Amino acid sequence: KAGPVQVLIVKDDHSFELDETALNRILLSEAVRDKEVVAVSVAGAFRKGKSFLMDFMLRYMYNQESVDWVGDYNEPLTGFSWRGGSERETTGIQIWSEIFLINKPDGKKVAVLLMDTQGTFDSQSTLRDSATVFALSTMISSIQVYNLSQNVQEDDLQHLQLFTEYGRLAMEETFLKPFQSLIFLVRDWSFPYEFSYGADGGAKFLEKRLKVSGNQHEELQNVRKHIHSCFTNISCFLLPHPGLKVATNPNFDGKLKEIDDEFIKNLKILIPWLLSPESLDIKEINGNKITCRGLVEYFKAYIKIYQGEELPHPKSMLQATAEANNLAAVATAKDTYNKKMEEICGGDKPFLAPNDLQTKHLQLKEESVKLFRGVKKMGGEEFSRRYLQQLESEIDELYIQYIKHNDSKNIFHAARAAALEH
Amino acid sequence: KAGPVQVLIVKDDHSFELDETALNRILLSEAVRDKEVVAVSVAGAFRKGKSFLMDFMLRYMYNQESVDWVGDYNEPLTGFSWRGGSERETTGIQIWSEIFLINKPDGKKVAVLLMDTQGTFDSQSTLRDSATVFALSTMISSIQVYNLSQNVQEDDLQHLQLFTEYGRLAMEETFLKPFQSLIFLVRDWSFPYEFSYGADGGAKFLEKRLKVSGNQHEELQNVRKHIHSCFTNISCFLLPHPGLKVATNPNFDGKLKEIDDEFIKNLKILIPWLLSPESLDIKEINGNKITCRGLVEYFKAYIKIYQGEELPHPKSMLQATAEANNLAAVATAKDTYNKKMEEICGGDKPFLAPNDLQTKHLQLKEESVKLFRGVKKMGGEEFSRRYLQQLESEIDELYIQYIKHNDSKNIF
Ligand SMILES: Nc1nc2c(ncn2[C@@H]2O[C@H](COP(=O)(O)OP(=O)(O)O)[C@@H](O)[C@H]2O)c(=O)[nH]1
Ligand SMILES: Nc1nc2c(ncn2[C@@H]2O[C@H](COP(=O)(O)OP(=O)(O)O)[C@@H](O)[C@H]2O)c(=O)[nH]1
Ligand code: ALF
Ligand code: ALF
Ligand SMILES: [Mg+2]
Ligand SMILES: [Mg+2]
């Protein structure tokens, strides 16, 4: 009996491991291994109805032939595990064990994989944990449903940019756009009088929200240019609130009779719109169409990169900023010291007695330390102590080099001093 | 007639302006200027009902004596401008023109100021615009209501950390915690069966959300330690959804009869829990209780710090990481060059023919350029061309110094 399969595991020590046996058992099966593959993923903030949606997608895939694919109104919703409560349910990445075989209008059979993901920004996870799940799901999928709550805020665009950038960095260089299709799915859209529920209102809303203008602040332009540059297709669907029973009643178990009718009406537009054979494009990577076995090879490779390579890993903005402020201040303080020692013991300057040089070095070092402490930086003095230590250390190193140069100007200084003394 | 007054103006060019005439007119009046002041702000993500809430706070402040301060169920909600639609309404910072005079159980008569703020993360705003509004409201207020939707996610904690840190940086050094009271107000809380609506459920929920344990990753511990360190008091209230009509009906005008009764029930607890005379903490800055006159002075002083460039301004996560990656790569590439040259022309190494020195330098500089280009960084060569050129220039400076050392070895 078909069921959800855990394929990417995130360990408690925040390491990532792929379950190759489970992945192979699904995608290396003889019936599907050489078939071209379509992969549909959902991703976004945690506790926002992603798995719930995926389970409705499952009903469609299993019942496309039916006049009533949505089902009997008294049936519970099953598949990927979903529930209320404020703590996350889905972790890592899971896929449905049954690969669906679809006929494209074109010709023969292509395979469809459904991927469910750990929601971002749960309190068990580092930023890197969230970035990795999101990036990988994006890199694997041919269609990414980016699930949001109520609105598309500027912080949402920044996260999307950061996560997709993390993915792209791990990919083969290509002059083509790295990904294919992205859907901004807004749950609980509250203003149908302003933009209609569905894909057209959604398109109109997003066209405005994402428009790149040369006159906007660079920060607003750049997040928008990045998102447009990552995907060949970007669309948006506005969905109504499902009603307060879905949201708040602990006995709710997914029965349509307990879901707002306007939601159901739009759900019935949304799912076939996402999953119709004509809209389902075969996954491509670096200009090549990929098969099921080929998709497994990429999953392994992408995981290995995240495990083994120097990648710039995502940092919280305070952290990122605190690091930048500190590195900049170290550079300046060090440069000031060096320039001033150069005036004193650069190559075109006379030899200095070791004690005079030490005195000059100590003064200048102190001046650079005082300068470094003076610069306002995010993170506090506690965050800066390591950098202060680094600055004093690098200055001492510069001094050592200076001594060697200074000595070379008068090797006999001490020997001659001792002879003259007597 | 009382009304909302625009006090911090945020212009289209992302510049900030204080309306001093307006601010002075409110807080320097004879009746209030010498009163100790309580300042209540609400802040957080845009389009989440902050102004709506403030307007219910206003009904309470005008009718604290009544059992039915919440109002006639047919009366519309007025005050700070609030409305639906996907575009922001409130910009900058507004205050209510009428300062309320309240008697604390103490005997201490105090002034109460209400602050409404531009929601963060709207599509017109730089990160710096959102940080400035949030930081200023937090630096000025004695009670900050941090308004959130549905849940308290890790990204919410990170934004709070960035914003409050930006605030602390514009403040005078202090041996005390920088801020006083913070309330995490979760709108549309959906899980009363897990944690009850209200302050008690809220407290249990937040205690778990913010608890620091030795088993936590450092990144998670650190956001929490920072937040606990910023505020003298941290609380949390879980509020039910007000109903789909409040959210979706374009003709809804704030009448209680159109608001879910359970929301109303919890609202009626929430407001006096926030604003009752015992709950009103007098604003303190660096250990001194502040008056209305004093608060005006800090408002001007704080804004002036934000108006200038004497502080490091926050950048988007990609941009900030991009700069960090780049500064780090400049350093590594430079140090690599320097160390190898040192091996070749350090003080304890023999004179090299000037042309040979040039040749070795050109090689080692090129190797450092490749090293720099080789390092993966967010985001793109485009962002890095500035840093690459900087790297090459600095290497050229180092070389100039090496030539002078090498030459001096042949001074004979
Ligand atoms: N407000 C709202 N709640 C939803 C929606 N769809 C599902 N839910 C509820 O969201 C909760 C979390 O569902 P789940 O699929 O596990 O969220 P996930 O963590 O993103 O996978 C469940 O209680 C669902 O009943 C929606 O569109 N709006
Ligand atoms: N979902 C929801 N909507 C609310 C709530 N309170 C107010 N609203 C609606 O939120 C919208 C925005 O209100 P407003 O106060 O102007 O938002 P602000 O931008 O945060 O100041 C209005 O349509 C209100 O009716 C709430 O608790 N939950
Ligand atoms: F909170 Al989830 F899948 F995002 F359980
Ligand atoms: F979107 Al607002 F006040 F935060 F109108
Ligand atoms: Mg899930
Ligand atoms: Mg407002």
UniProtKB/Swiss-Prot annotation, chain A:
Source organism of this protein record:
Homo sapiens
Region described as Linker: spans on this chain: 409-416
Give the catalytic activity: GTP + H2O = GDP + phosphate + H(+)
Q: Where is the GB1/RHD3-type G domain?
A: 34-279
Tell me what the record says results from N325K: In HSN1D; the mutant protein has decreased GTPase activity compared to wild-type and causes disruption of endoplasmic reticulum network morphology
**Part of the whole protein covered:** 31 to 446 of 558
**N6-acetyllysine: residues bearing it:** K365
Protein residues bound to GTP: R47, K48, G49, K50, S51, F52, R187, D188, V246
Which amino acids does the record list as binding Mg(2+)? Answer: S51
Q: What happens when you mutate Y166C?
A: In a patient with hereditary spastic paraplegia; uncertain significance; no effect on homodimerization and GTPase activity
Q: What does the record say mutating R187Q does?
A: In SPG3; loss of GTP-binding; loss of homodimerization; loss of GTPase-dependent fusogenic activity; changed endoplasmic reticulum tubular network membrane organization
- Name of the molecule in the record: Atlastin-1
Q: Which residues lie toward the Cytoplasmic compartment?
A: 1-416
Q: Which residue ranges are recorded for the region named 3HB (three-helix bundle) domain?
A: 317-408
UniProtKB/Swiss-Prot annotation, chain B:
Kindly list the biological process annotations in GO that this record carries: axonogenesis; endoplasmic reticulum membrane fusion; endoplasmic reticulum organization; endoplasmic reticulum tubular network membrane organization; protein homooligomerization
Keyword Coiled coil listed = yes
Q: What class of enzyme is it?
A: hydrolase
Listed result of changing K50A:
Changed endoplasmic reticulum tubular network organization. Alters endoplasmic reticulum morphogenesis
What are its E.C. numbers?
3.6.5.-
Every copy of the GB1/RHD3-type G domain together lies at 34-279
Expression tissues: Expressed predominantly in the adult and fetal central nervous system. Measurable expression in all tissues examined, although expression in adult brain is at least 50-fold higher than in other tissues. Detected predominantly in pyramidal neurons in the cerebral cortex and the hippocampus of the brain. Expressed in upper and lower motor neurons (at protein level).
GO CC, sorted alphabetically, is:
axon; endoplasmic reticulum; endoplasmic reticulum membrane; endoplasmic reticulum tubular network; endoplasmic reticulum tubular network membrane; Golgi apparatus; Golgi cis cisterna membrane; Golgi membrane
Where does the protein end up?
Endoplasmic reticulum membrane; Golgi apparatus membrane; Cell projection, Axon
Magnesium among the record's keywords?
A: yes
Which positions are annotated as binding Mg(2+)?
A: S51
Q: How is it modified after translation?
A: Phosphorylated. Phosphorylation, by different kinases, of the N-terminal hypervariable region (HVR) regulates the ATL1-mediated membrane tethering step.
Give the GO molecular function terms. GTP binding; GTPase activity; GTPase-dependent fusogenic activity; identical protein binding
Q: What is the effect of changing H228R?
A: In SPG3; increased GTPase-dependent fusogenic activity
Entry coiled-coil feature ranges? 382-409
Q: Which portions of the sequence form the region 3HB (three-helix bundle) domain?
A: 317-408
Q: How does it sit in the membrane?
A: Multi-pass membrane protein
In this UniProt entry, which residues form the Cytoplasmic topological domain(s)? 1-412
Write out the residues that bind GDP: R47, K48, G49, K50, S51, F52, Q118, R187, D188, V246, N249
Q: What does this protein do?
A: Atlastin-1 (ATL1) is a membrane-anchored GTPase that mediates the GTP-dependent fusion of endoplasmic reticulum (ER) membranes, maintaining the continuous ER network. It facilitates the formation of three-way junctions where ER tubules intersect. Two atlastin-1 on neighboring ER tubules bind GTP and form loose homodimers through the GB1/RHD3-type G domains and 3HB regions. Upon GTP hydrolysis, the 3HB regions tighten, pulling the membranes together to drive their fusion. After fusion, the homodimer disassembles upon release of inorganic phosphate (Pi).
| Recorded family membership | Belongs to the TRAFAC class dynamin-like GTPase superfamily. GB1/RHD3 GTPase family. GB1 subfamily.
Record text about domains: The N-terminal hypervariable region (HVR) regulates ATL1-mediated membrane tethering by organizing ATL1 into a lattice structure on the same membrane. It does not affect GTP hydrolysis or membrane fusion. It has no effect on the GTP hydrolysis and fusion steps.
Provide the protein name.
Atlastin-1
Organism expressing this protein natively:
Homo sapiens (Human)
At the highest ranks, the source species' classification is: Eukaryota, Metazoa, Chordata, Craniata, Vertebrata
Q: Which residues of the full protein are shown?
A: 31 to 442 of 558
